[PDB]
UniProtKB/Swiss-Prot annotation, chain B:
This is Dihydroorotase. PANTHER family: DIHYDROOROTASE. Pathway: Pyrimidine metabolism; UMP biosynthesis via de novo pathway; (S)-dihydroorotate from bicarbonate: step 3/3. Induction: Induced by pyrimidine limitation. Catalyzes the reversible cyclization of carbamoyl aspartate to dihydroorotate. Zn(2+) 1 binds at H13, H15, K99, D247. It catalyses: (S)-dihydroorotate + H2O = N-carbamoyl-L-aspartate + H(+). GO terms for biological process: 'de novo' pyrimidine nucleobase biosynthetic process; 'de novo' UMP biosynthetic process; pyrimidine nucleotide biosynthetic process. The lineage of its organism: Bacteria, Pseudomonadati, Pseudomonadota, Gammaproteobacteria, Enterobacterales. There is an asymmetry between active sites in the dimer, with dihydroorotate bound to the active site of subunit A and N-carbamoyl-L-aspartate bound to the active site of subunit B. It comes from Escherichia coli (strain K12). The gene is pyrC.
Amino acid sequence: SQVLKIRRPDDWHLHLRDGDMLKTVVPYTSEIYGRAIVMPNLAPPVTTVEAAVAYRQRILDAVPAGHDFTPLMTCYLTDSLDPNELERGFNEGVFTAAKLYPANHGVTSVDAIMPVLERMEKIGMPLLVHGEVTHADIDIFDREARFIESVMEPLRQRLTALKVVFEHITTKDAADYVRDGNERLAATITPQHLMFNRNHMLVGGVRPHLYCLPILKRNIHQQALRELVASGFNRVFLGTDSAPHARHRKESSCGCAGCFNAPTALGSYATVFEEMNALQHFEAFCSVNGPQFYGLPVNDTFIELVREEQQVAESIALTDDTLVPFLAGETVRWSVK
Amino acid sequence: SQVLKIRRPDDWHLHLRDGDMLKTVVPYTSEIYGRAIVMPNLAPPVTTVEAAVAYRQRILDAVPAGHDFTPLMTCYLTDSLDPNELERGFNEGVFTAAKLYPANASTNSSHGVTSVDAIMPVLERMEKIGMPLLVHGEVTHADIDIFDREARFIESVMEPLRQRLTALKVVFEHITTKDAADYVRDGNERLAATITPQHLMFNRNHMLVGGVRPHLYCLPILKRNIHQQALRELVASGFNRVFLGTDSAPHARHRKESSCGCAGCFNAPTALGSYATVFEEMNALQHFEAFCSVNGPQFYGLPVNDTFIELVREEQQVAESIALTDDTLVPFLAGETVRWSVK
Ligand SMILES: NC(=O)N[C@@H](CC(=O)O)C(=O)O
Ligand SMILES: O=C1C[C@@H](C(=O)O)NC(=O)N1
Ligand SMILES: [Zn+2]
Ligand SMILES: [Zn+2]
Ligand SMILES: [Zn+2]
Ligand SMILES: [Zn+2]
C-alpha cells in the first residue's frame, strides 16, 4: 500500500566484473541507478585510460536499450602508477576517482604513491579507500579500526585538501571518525552491514553469501552504522559494494568475499531507514549526498518504492553455474514500482 | 627420523554418526585409540539405555577385525529424561557419562534442555552417583555475540552449577578461550577439559582471511589469537586435567561447502599427529603422552592403556578426500603435508 517516491538513486560503489558476468549483472544496476562508481579490480586491474575506455564501452554494450545509465570509471592505484596517466584520464572525463586497495597488485604503502596522491589533491580527484590493514598478525575484525589510526589519519593530516571516501565502513570506529570529520571526508555503507552483524553469518551454520570484506562485525558496530545513516548525516551515501561471484566460487572450501546485492539493495536500504524511523533522510542517502560530495548534479528523474513484499529469486542463471543473490529465497519489504 | 612412542591414546570427545557414515569413519578412530567417548547427538538423540546399547553394537559391527577399540557411550540430557533411566544406564555400564548441550527454551523436551534449572533432578542424580557431566559450554541467546557465548556460559551456568552441586564432576568440553583455560586451570579436582587439534593449531583468522573456510568452521567457533595462545600454553604447562578430545565431527562435503555450512571438523584421521606438532612447537613433548593417554583415564577413574603406539617424524600428505557411499568427506588438513604420522 505505502508508496515512497524518491529522486532516482546512484550507486557510489559497484563491482560489475567483465565478460559474461558483466552482461548478466549490469541490468540489475542499470534499470534503477542513474550512475554507478565502477570499481577497477578486474584481472588484470584497470590502471590506464585506455583500459578504462574499453571497459566503459563493454559496460555500455551490456546496458539494455532504454536504461539511462552512466558508468563512472575508476583507476586502480598501484605503487608504480604514473601521476600523468591518472591526471590525463581525469582530464578526459574517463576517471571519476581512484581506488586504493591495500596490498592483499594493490598499494603497499601510502609513501610509495605520495606523488600520485599529491596530484589527486591538486586536481580535485577524490580518493576512494578500502580501509583495512593486512598484516598477518592483525585479527581480521581489527583491520578497519587499525587502518584509521595508522594510515587514514596520517594521510588526511598530510594531504589536507584531499577528498576521501572511506568505502563500505563497518565499525563504530569508522562511523565516529567520519561523523567527526570535515567536508572532505565521506563514507559509503552497504546494505549488508546495516542489516546484519557477524552472528547472521556464523550462527546456525556458516553463510558464505554473507561473507564479504570488510568482514561483518559485532552488533554494536552494526548499531553504530544504523544510527549514523538514521541521523541524517549528509556525508554518508549509498554504495552497495555489489560484488558477484558464481555460486560454487562462494560455496567451496575457500569461498570468495562479496555479496551480490544489486537486485535487492535499494529496498533493503528502505527497510533499514523505515526501521530507524528515518525515511525523511532516505532520499538524501540514495540520491543527493553522493552527488554533493562528488560535485556532480543530482538526477532529474524519479522512481517509486512500494511496501509490498517480494520474494527474492533463489538463483540467477549464468552461462555456467548460477549466481546466488543476497537474500536469495527471502522476502524484501519494499520493491521498486 | 625421530620416533615418539606413547601408551595407546583415547579420544575423550568423538562423533561417530550412524549408518553408512559410521561405517566409513569408525576405522580412523579404532585403528589408533583404545577407547572413545561417543557423543549422543544422533537424529534422534541417544536418550535411553536401549538406544545406547543398540548404537554401541552398530559401532562394534563397524570396527575392523583386530582393532582393540571400545566405545564409551553417553546419554544426551533432555528435559524429559527420567533420572532413573540415566542412573540405570550408568549402573549397568552402558552410560559412561552424560552430555549437556546448550539450553534453549524452544527445544522439544525429547531433544534437549530448556534451561539448566529445569533438569536439576537429573544433575543431582549424576552428582549423587558420581557420573561425570560433559558440557558443551555455550549460551545460545540470539542477542549474544557468537564469540562471547563460551565466556557467558562460564559466568551464567558453569560457576553457579558447580556452586550448587559441589560434588559434581564436570568436563568442560572443547574449550576455546583464555576465559575457559583460566577457569579450568583455577578449578578443583572435579573440573577438567578437552581441547581439539583445530583450536590449538588455528584461530579465527585462519577461517576468514583470504577466503571463508567452512572446513575450519566448528562450534565453539575459533576465537582470536590471544585465546589460541592460552590454550597452547595450558596444554604445554603439564596441567593434568586437560586431555585429548578431538571433537571429530564429520559432515559430507556438500553439507560443508554449501550456502549454510554445517559445523564440525573431520579430524580423526590427522588429530594425533596434529597434537604432537603443537606439543613439539611448544617445547612441551614431555607432557604429550599424559595429554593423550593418562589424564583422561585418571579423571574418569579408568585404567591407562597397556599397549603402545609410535609416531614418526616423517612427512606425509593427507588425503584430499575420503569416499563415502554417497559424496565424500574432506579430512582436517586435507591435501597438506603433516610433520608427524603414526608408524
Ligand atoms: N567487498 C568484497 O567482499 N568483495 C569485493 C572487494 C572489495 O570491496 O574489497 C570484490 O571485488 O569481490
Ligand atoms: O557442538 C558441535 C557439534 C558437532 C557436530 O557436528 O556434531 N560439530 C561441532 O562443530 N560442534
Ligand atoms: Zn573494498
Ligand atoms: Zn568493493
Ligand atoms: Zn560440542
Ligand atoms: Zn562434539
